[PDB]
Structure 1
Amino acid sequence: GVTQTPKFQVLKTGQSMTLQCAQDMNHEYMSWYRQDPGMGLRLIHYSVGAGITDQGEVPNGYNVSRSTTEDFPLRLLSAAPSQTSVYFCASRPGLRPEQYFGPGTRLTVTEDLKNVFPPEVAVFEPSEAEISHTQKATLVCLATGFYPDHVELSWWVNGKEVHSGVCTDPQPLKEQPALNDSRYALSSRLRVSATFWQDPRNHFRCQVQFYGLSENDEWTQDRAKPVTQIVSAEAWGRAD
């Protein structure tokens, strides 16, 4: 239905960016919103039909374009730290009065790109005391020292992505809570029967997709350019 690209974006203060939005339900009405913790959904701009654009509640710093009915891009003129937010596109028929939202775009605007750090990922193997006591085995995955908070953590068992027996923290922790450009930490758990963990043929992987810089970005640091990448840690089953 409603599509949004990119899913995540890190911007440097002053840069321009266009968040793409496209629906295929032949809807006349399209809108953009930003979602912030203390004040929910705030309408930025909206389009009642092809060629018609109108300011919403918070239009300052943004432009919208509506040449065709399918697409409605949101242009950030000159990125500012106050534009760090989650952006949502939404399509409504405008003729059924129901509105459908896009997947969202997590955007972080930083004063400089030297703040962006990819996560370090580690898998912590189940405890023998847990195994004997409960007959279950919990693997823990930790993603640490990442900035911005634009990460997707998945668990993979024997090459297949798994969802059962897993729970990842809904929000990451701040390593330095007093700081604004603090790096983050995220944990996840995957519980399995003791018998499943005890089979050495079973392979467990914790995969963290991080979104950062592009290969085109300039970089002066000795450390590797913190590009968009997957960082993963693994553990094999063990009869012990």
Structure 2
Amino acid sequence: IVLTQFPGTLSLSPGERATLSCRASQSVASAYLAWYQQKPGQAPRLLIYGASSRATDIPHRFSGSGSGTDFTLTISRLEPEDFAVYYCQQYGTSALLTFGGGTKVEIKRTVAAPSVFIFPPSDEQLKSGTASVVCLLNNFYPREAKVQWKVDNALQSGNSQESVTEQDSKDSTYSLSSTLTLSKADYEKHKVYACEVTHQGFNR
């Protein structure tokens, strides 16, 4: 019933086999277990039915195996047409349905130099009344590089927001933007503005 996907997220160069395991709590037939595929920001798609047989007009590159409580989707060669988020799932029967954890499949990207930008609210921002300090970072490593609004041994939390770009379908890039939702005076009281910078290697 409860479906878990191992690993949670995988990055692999196109053309190589990828194996995604599915674990359940219930001794279920492999007929009631399948695998769907979803492209980002789009409707998903049926990939493999019955955990062993391929669906309509899908090349023999994919395959499925397993039963009972352990299932496995194995793609012999993967291409960017199918680099997507994949879901093992039990369906239809027992009157209830649920989906997998959605293992996003990624393309391996070389370790390049990340880009960092920081901008305090300029004068136009100040007279707009929304003096939001912003910092953005792009083409980085890793995806989960966590930064926080560190000012003079001070946390800023519970008020900021962060937007994360979806993985690029061509360059597999990622980008994050952290912005503050605060009034002008709340920005003006502080004097130094910056968010902490972590890598492998500004006046009011």
Give the whole-Å Cα distance in 2 for the aligned partners of 1:160 and 1:3.
Answer: 34
- Quick check: 2:20–2:73 contact (8 Å CA) kept in 1? yes
Residue 87 of structure 1 is matched in structure 2 by 86
Q: Work out the CA distance in 1 between the residues paired with 2:116 and 2:140.
A: 10
Are residue 78 (structure 1) and residue 73 (structure 2) matched? Answer: no
Separation of aligned partners in 1, 2:18 and 2:172: 24
Identity score, percent: 27
For 1:19, the equivalent position in structure 2 comes to 20
Q: Hey, what does 1:139 align to over in structure 2?
A: 133
| 1:193 aligned residue | 183
2-structure distance, mates of 1:124, 1:25: 53
Name the structure 1 match of 2:161: 166
Q: How does 1:1-240 map to 2 (within 5 A)?
A: 1-24=2-25, 29-36=32-39, 40-47=43-50, 53-57=52-56, 58=58, 60-69=60-69, 71-92=70-91, 94-96=93-95, 98-109=96-107, 114=110, 117=112, 119-134=114-129, 136-146=130-140, 151=143, 156-157=148-149, 162=158, 164-166=159-161, 168=163, 171=166, 180-181=170-171, 183=173, 185-200=175-190, 205=195
TM-score of the two chains, using structure 1 as the length reference = 0.59
Task: Tell me if structure 2 keeps the 8 A contact 1:142–1:188.
Answer: yes
Q: Does the CA contact (< 8 Å) of 1:155 and 1:190 recur in 2?
A: no
Q: In structure 2, how many angstroms separate the alpha carbons of the residues matched to 1:119 and 1:103?
A: 29
Tell me by how many angstroms 1:13 deviates.
Answer: 3.5
Q: Structure 1 or 2: larger strand share?
A: 1
Against the structure 1 CA distance between its residues 121 and 138, is the aligned structure 2 distance closer, same or farther, given a 3 Å change threshold?
same
Alpha-carbon distance change, 124 to 153 in structure 1, aligned in 2, over 3 angstroms: farther
Task: Assess if the C-alpha contact under 8 Å between 1:122 and 1:143 holds in 2.
Answer: yes
User: CA 1:154 to 1:199, structure 2 compared with 1: closer, same or farther past 3 Å?
Assistant: farther
Cα displacement string for residues 82-104 of structure 1 (whole angstroms, at most 9, x for unaligned residues) = 332222232336231x4322232
The number of equivalent residue pairs is 195
Find the aligned partners of 2:73 and 2:126 in 1 and give their Cα distance.
Answer: 52
**Structure 2 CA distance for aligned equivalents of residues 44 and 120 of structure 1:** 37
Give the counterpart letter for 1:3 in structure 2: T
Superposition TM-score, scaled by structure 2 size: 0.66
Give the conservation status (yes or no) of the 8 Å contact 2:65–2:72.
yes
1:16-64 CA deviation, whole Å, 9 max, x = no partner? 22123223366652221112369732222234xxxx6332233631222
SS of residue in 2 equivalent to 1:130 = helix
Task: Note if contact 2:136-2:178 (Cα within 8 Å) is conserved in structure 1.
Answer: yes
Q: Cα offset for 1:12?
A: 2.0
In the alignment, is the contact (CA less than 8 A) between 1:123 and 1:142 conserved in 2?
A: yes
Residues 74-123 of structure 1: per-residue CA shift (max 9 Å, x gap): 11213333332222232336231x4322232222446xx54x54643333
Checking the alignment, whether the CA contact within 8 Å between 1:168 and 1:188 is kept in structure 2 is: yes
CA contact (8 A) 1:8 1:107 kept: yes
